[PDB]
Amino acid sequence: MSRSQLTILTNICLIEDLETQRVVMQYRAWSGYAFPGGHVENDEAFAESVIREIYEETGLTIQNPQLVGIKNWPLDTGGRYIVICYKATEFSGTLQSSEEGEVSWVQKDQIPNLNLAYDMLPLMEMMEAPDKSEFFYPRRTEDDWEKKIF
Amino acid sequence: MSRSQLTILTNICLIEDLETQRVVMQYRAWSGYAFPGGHVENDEAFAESVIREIYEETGLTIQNPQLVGIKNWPLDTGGRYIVICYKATEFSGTLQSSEEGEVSWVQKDQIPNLNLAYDMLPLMEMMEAPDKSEFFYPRRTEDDWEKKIF
Ligand SMILES: [Mg+2]
Ligand SMILES: [Mg+2]
Known part of the structure; x- marks a missing residue:
């Protein structure tokens, strides 16, 4: 019945232009500033979903997106919010914003200087680390936004 | 209401003893023969779940399990079955079966000679491949068990 009982499936992608380092x-x-991505449709694969969402939100077609981790947290009544995290360096197309947000190429080394969404930097760190694959909020108390990286 | 509307969260782990190649x-x-693992509890992280399930099913305590892919398929009415796939080479303990199945150390090169669960070999291949991370059944028709690897 309630929204806190649901399992929500979403994705994000770190799209990195290796030529420009943006x-x-x-x-x-x-x-704040965050990675583009969206909700997984009922019939589509996770990889299909991230490619489709990225195309809609950015105008870019990514190829061979790589799973780099999962961000997730329990909801109040048995639910869970799930973010499947991808990285893509192979893409084509022209950058184009959508109603869902303005998109821009930001120099990777300048990302920390933006007004970022909460926990963007440790999330990006988990994604980029070859030996880490989960960012979890235990939500042990109602105000607990402490995180665990596995 | 129906079971085909649910999102089911499970894990498996390929536990490889690098000393014995089993x-x-x-x-x-x-x-048939398959990898051990189990269902994710409402409050636990994905990594916590695989460690706990593996301990219960095998007697082994795995350390630092690595995400290697996701096996998943849509269910008939908007649901999805999800298997988070791990590999672990660091562990301790003594192998011990449980009510949930007999466990054994099998030489890795002898795995194909077992009576395996359906699609075990391509699943293991997806997991082991550094550039593949999803095993998906589109379930386009009712008898369609064709797969996609991303
Ligand atoms: Mg979005
Ligand atoms: Mg099990």
């Missing part, structure tokens, strides 16, 4: 950032009015 | 296999009366 990454696609999206501005979402949690608030 | 892998833990579990016999489940889909039927």
Whole structure:
């Protein structure tokens, strides 16, 4: 019945242009600059979903997106929010914003200087680390946004 | 309401003893030899779940399990079955079966000679491949068990 009982399936992608050392950032009015991505449709694969969402949100067609981790947290009544995290360096197309947010190429080394969504930097660190694959909020108490990286 | 509307969260782990080149296999009366693992509890992280399930099913405590892919397929009415796939080479303990299946160390090169669960070999191949991370059944028709690897 309640929203806190649901399992929500979403994705994000770190799209990195190796020629320019820039990454696609999206501005979402949690608030701030974050990675683009979206919700998984009922019939589509996880990889199909990230390719489709990225195309819609950025105008870019990514190839062979790589699974780099999972961000997730329990909801209040047995539910869970799930973010499947991808990295893509192979893509084509022209960058184009959508109603879902303004997108831009930001120099990767300048990402920390933006108004970032909460925990963007440790999330990007988990994704980039070859030996880490999960970012979890235990949500042990109602205000607990402490994280665990596995 | 129906079981085909649910999102089911499970894990498996390929536990490889690098000293002996054996892998833990579990016999489940889909039927056949498969990897051990289990269902994710409401409050636990994905990594916590695989460590706990593997301990219960095998007696081994795995350390630092690595995400190597996701096996998944849609269910008939908007649901999805999800298997988070891990590999672990660091562990301790003594192998011990449980009510959930007999476990054994099988030489990795002898795995194909077992009565394996359906698609075990391509699943293991997806997991072992550094550039593949999803095993998906589109379930386009009712008898369609064709697969896609991303
Ligand atoms: Mg989106
Ligand atoms: Mg099990």
